[PDB]
């Protein structure tokens, strides 16, 4: 009939393939679709939704309701940082279980500028200023405020508004970083210091609270889907 | 700009095909025990964890299918006698059709039900199934009941139902048997069904499961402490 | 700029007006089928019956954990909407959940108002999906969350009721991941109101209301309340729901399910 | 540089991505 | 003029495909020893010598790939009992994905990772891999470190690294196992992976290695005397 | 469907061949190249580079 | 001749398929049809025919 | 989106549905 | 005398030299 | 309804009826 | 009556007589 010749790679079953395949139930009248609200066209409309991170993971209050809020007060020391975490959105345990984390554990490489949004939920009369700062890798992680004001930072006020927005830029030698704990492609560091002390009047609670969020801008992108490590089938 | 966002699309996120079950079927002399001359498998996706936890980012979805049957075999004796090449009959059964009861009933005549004859040793089977839903989309996470207990009921069991279930029997079963008559030498078989969705449209995103699964519900019993130990101000 | 938010006969004014989240960007409407061959008209209570019904008032203390309702489960007690939902076999609706919670300038804390579609909670006993009807639909009185998972051991009299955990949100997700739902935060520093317009999200075009419950509201105190220096402080929370653009179909005899 | 896609089967679910 | 210079081009110089590894995998009764029920292989080209010494004419390069899996089998007893035809599961694992630990874990469900089922006896497997680098080119001969020891370190091991290495785990592993359950008769398998680069672009030529290799570095220990004996003025 | 006929030379693996082959990781966003200096287009721009020979190979 | 590549789903026998198939008796002179009354073009001209149901199914 | 049907055999009963 | 090259697969790495 | 006959071989006896 | 010859490979020695 026709002189064909088999090539290698025949009779295998590769899992990632797009071959034609014979239907089992032919002549089938498919139910037509309707306009159900909220269609997801791409995985990036899940990472870009602003979600909360767990910050205070100490051993009394981890895996508890109160692991999300950070206690900052009037009697806090002014030279010590409020919170510190590196920018590794799949290997850092404070950022692994966020919605940005739970998407980036499926993909190996990632790149894009991602943004943070803090929320001050104290009383109305409480004021103060907070310095939130970012530092690219290569040096020591910044310890005091004297060496942390050099990098990209945003002085955030607590009196006018109650929320900042810090867009961490994309500074990297490589085009794509990884979603593993690696030292060749390290993200950076995030730290938050007191610019000035919190000023609280009398008949006002001294212990305020803070919630921190994370998102991704419209240039974030990933590739090379793979497995995940946030599940275990105990059989 | 200049970043291909094509790897993260929905049709590319479900490109891999994960297993959904492993079915034992044996070919021995018919004993008084539970004879595995034919085996049955309720069609569901909530048997493994990696496909279940991946589909449950989304409340509603509609998608085609492409199944794939991979069949292995063994012996049970060291220098066991040789045996000829075997033929398997995979058989689909819609809900309501008569269920087989013995090895060779009147129902294995496949006069209406689609069935696949798979000679052992060749390329795997590979069939497609269209959108067989009856609503406009498959419904993960049905909230209500199937029945509502009325005040005018005689007893409790008439209006009794099961929480979060649409139908008792969704999509029927597969019924795998071996066509060849039994031998004094027995050959243990293990069919693995793969599943690769096609033409995927999803709606209404929701966050993923982060404690291990337990049964076909949405409940939980064990390992209620997912987040690990990590200091507050340590980078 | 002060919202004179009026639907039907009732009117929701405000002292502060900031935003109004429309869930998934779609305002509610009726069924829009251009390929409709029957032109006969269903039973629509839409001439004056888009009203704001007001649920019970709950008290948010210092050690309170959360509240949850269902929809249209919460509206079966009051209104003429509660009567149309029983005589008609199937119908659809859209909602505007409005949650007001006032406080002074010296209180602090912040709620979080969610609206989870298809909000399947978790049972307590090891019998899987084993929950009675009356315990799974508490009505307008709602239900409360808990701290730890305490499963039931009484086997001759099983409780057959939920036991959700707050930071698991009942379903099994984390709470920090629960902002992909359409939400709102009642930060007592700045605002004291929260209005969320909910469209009809369901797989069918129109579905029953006695057995199915589309949306689920969950109020979580994200930060604990605190007055000046005391240890006992209670402010009230009041929820208000308005059924917008409802329609019904297919009359039958009335159905009264048992609620023990 | 391009390629060629020819749908062989009548059914809709039989086609490729 | 009138000499075809086409045989010496770069795309024709890398036209042949040389082996990169040989992997043992066995199918026996599970012993207390190091069970070769599944085997793993770190993806690298610097395991053999003929492909390594050929690629190291060039400092930077970028190229696709085409792997090929050739599988043989044996018995271990003289008149050993017969056995049915076997099925192998080659499985790719990206860096960071969970590594299998037993013969049958939750991770062999291949729900995200691409995997190749190869029935024994047929044509060999033959799959292609695109340019999976994260820089603009693969980098042979990385000069620097991964980490830089700072003055402010506590001890030496924090800033410790390894000379001439970009990442600890490049490109993950393959994880070959046999799908069939074990038998009292055991079948020794030896998978050979071939590798044929495609679409090759290279840069920055350098002279080839002329003492024998030693480890994955660029160092040397033995046979430091390559040139033979030959007189000065003898033709 | 279509009456094909196998020819000899089927199911072999010849090493020097240019067949099509199925990709394993589809829909992949390849890193774009840049102008790294010194591109070699052919093996003849390695032989034509002037290099030193060893002449005096006496045994000392 | 032509470099083909087998895909999975080969050598199986699916029951619901529409493949070409070689005839056994070629060059056959088929008896031509005539207009027999009452042609059924679809199963729906059997359900739409008005038929009686059994109502009184008591045990006598 | 369409497909291609090419009848290969001469006989009438050999064709497809 | 010539020949015919028809790229069958969508991916770029799948093509021939 | 028709079909397609393409003679593949050079020899005369190789063709079909 | 004729036939069809389509050279498939790039190499010259690969062709037919």
Residue numbers in the entry:
A (entry chain 3): 1 to 235
B (entry chain 1), E (entry chain 1): 66 to 300
C (entry chain 2): 12 to 271
D (entry chain 4), H (entry chain 4), I (entry chain 4), J (entry chain 4), K (entry chain 4): 25 to 41
F (entry chain 3), G (entry chain 3): 1 to 60
Text from the published report:
Poliovirus (PV), a member of the Picornaviridae, is the causative agent of poliomyelitis and destroys motor neurons in the central nervous system causing paralysis or even death. Genome-free (empty) PV particles, such as recombinantly expressed VLPs, do not undergo the final maturation cleavage of VP0 into VP2 and VP4, which rearranges the proteins on the inside of the virus capsid with a concomitant increase in particle stability. Therefore, to produce an effective vaccine from empty particles, it will be necessary to stabilize the particles to maintain the desired antigenic phenotype. To confirm the authenticity of the plant-expressed PV VLPs, we have determined structures of the stabilized plant-expressed PV3 SktSC8 sVLPs by cryo-EM in the absence and presence of the GPP3 pocket-binding compound.
